[PDB]
Design a protein around this ligand. Structure first.
Ligand SMILES: O=C(C[C@@]1(C(=O)Nc2cncc3ccccc23)CCOc2ccc(Cl)cc21)N1CCC[C@@H]1Cn1ccnc1
Ligand SMILES: [Cl-]
Lengths: 302, 298
């Protein structure tokens, strides 16, 4: 019993965190095999950030300009290339602590763990989701750039995020491990704003199923809804449209609890209408949207 | 910017998790040097009588895909200490510490000696933890990392009928009035960790949330009279002193922040949130707020 926002054990990722320094800039890098991956803005100063020509800044750099540090050991950079917004620093030593890994690009609504690092040193781990507006509501201070987002499925670490910037609303933008940004974001200190955020509906439904599994049924009603009428109501509360894929993905949770997805949808409709009325659901006074159907099946069952 | 429930990096603890099996019972063990620590209920009650019937080879210990041979066994309160032939090479710098209610720690939840998740939680004033544990999680540990040293503070033993959890420090002493026995046990009436709510209000001010602030101040006694009415833990002078650095950083005196809390308790949030929450968060200590809003690394 119990429902917590649970991050994956960070151990496999901790053994990959290194410090990357180029001139005065110092951020984090991910050392996997003989390659260190880090945000390409490590080559930039604060001046360069307005309109940086990365190919032009990188062509002026040699291998020895990049000081890489794994613990108390300096790694020798033997090569460097750029893949989108990530810099790939070829080093002379392969990381002995390299785990089984994959680079995965996630879709909005997907959750992952973030190992927040400063100066190549892991300082904390937390769980978060890719918001529908392609930002993450993270906890990052200056020097956290290069901190990574990951999921561990079995023994394999699936890297899905590298931190690059904080938007003016305090939310964060980053890339996948191939340098492609999530969202219309760019690694430039230009006028960029996070789009209007929406609630991840499939996740709220999944979290309501977790509450039913944990014995909380106060929010259930005798009503059902059509997918279209639910989306008409959901859109008015800035909820993401629930698609037929979301309904299919919720199938196992619906079967386990005996509450049809559209029946749970009607509870959500009523919850949006009435609020909680001094009540909580899984110790929360707000509808939680940062637990996927897979997270619920993982934590409530296995 | 950003405020999340943040756990310590679990890596140093992951390298200590082993599987302990005695008969049909299977749970987790903490392998530190040549000893494996685990709940004494793995033998299951008269624990001296059940343990005297066990030999070393009855305890199957598994570190990954390697079986460890138990060469000895002793009991320290509610914890079983299984002496193994091999010292854990991944043993970190560590201490066994007993924590006080209100203090927080990270829990590395494990099943069959395999870490599956990490979360932050606080020792509730009623000595239970609002954790997330399924069957097979017994032996999962609570810890804080101070610089390079892992301070083990909790070993999970059981779940109470309200879904909350009970366990011991790493010396086998239970937190709270619990016993490792299938009997009528209930968690006492819980209270809100006041110093933690105040610390979390300071974190909201650091993150640019000032809607709840007012021009008012209060005396410690008047705040305690109000707090005791809402099942809040009494705020002591030590709490006031501990919140000093946050009071200096934000320019809001502790009794000034207490007046904000008093108004939130009597009036509510009014459709507003603080750090994305509609409830007053009490599972962040003043140190957690300082550590997260400074960037302390391990
Ligand atoms: O500019 C940036 C980083 C930046 C950014 O967002 N940083 C931060 C990240 N995470 C959390 C943060 C919390 C508090 C303050 C800053 C944070 C600044 C704002 O403008 C942008 C715009 C775009 C991008 Cl991709 C990056 C940034 N850096 C980081 C190194 C190199 C370079 C120039 N540089 C040098 C020395 N300090 C900064
Ligand atoms: Cl995905």
């Amino acid at each position: 019993s119990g429902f917590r926002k649970m991050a994956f054990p960070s151990g496999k990722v901790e053994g990959c965190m290194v410090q990357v320094t180029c001139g005065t800039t110092t951020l984090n890098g991910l050392w996997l095999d003989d390659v260190v991956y880090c945000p390409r803005h490590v080559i930039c100063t604060s001046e360069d950030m307005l309109n940086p020509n990365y190919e032009d800044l990188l062509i002026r750099k040699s291998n020895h300009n990049f000081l890489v540090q794994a613990g108390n050991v300096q790694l020798r950079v033997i090569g460097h290339s750029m893949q989108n917004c990530v810099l790939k620093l070829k080093v002379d030593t392969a990381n002995p602590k390299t785990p089984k890994y994959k680079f995965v690009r996630i879709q909005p609504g997907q959750t992952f763990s973030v190992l927040a690092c400063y100066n190549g040193s892991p300082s904390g781990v937390y769980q978060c989701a890719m918001r529908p507006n392609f930002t993450i509501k993270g906890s990052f201070l200056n020097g956290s750039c290069g901190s990574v987002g990951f999921n561990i499925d079995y023994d394999c670490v699936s890297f899905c995020y590298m931190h690059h910037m904080e938007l003016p609303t305090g939310v964060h933008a980053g890339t996948d491990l191939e340098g492609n940004f999530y969202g219309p974001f760019v690694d430039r200190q230009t006028a960029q704003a996070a789009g209007t955020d929406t609630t991840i509906t499939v996740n709220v439904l999944a979290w309501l199923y977790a509450a039913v599994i944990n014995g909380d049924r106060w929010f259930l009603n005798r009503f059902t809804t059509t997918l279209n009428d639910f989306n008409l109501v959901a859109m008015k509360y800035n909820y993401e449209p629930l698609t037929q894929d979301h309904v299919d993905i919720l199938g196992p949770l619906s079967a386990q609890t005996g509450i049809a997805v559209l029946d749970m949808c009607a509870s959500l409709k009523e919850l949006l209408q009435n609020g909680m009325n001094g009540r909580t659901i899984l110790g929360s006074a707000l509808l939680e949207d940062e637990f996927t159907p897979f997270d619920v099946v993982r934590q409530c069952s296995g």
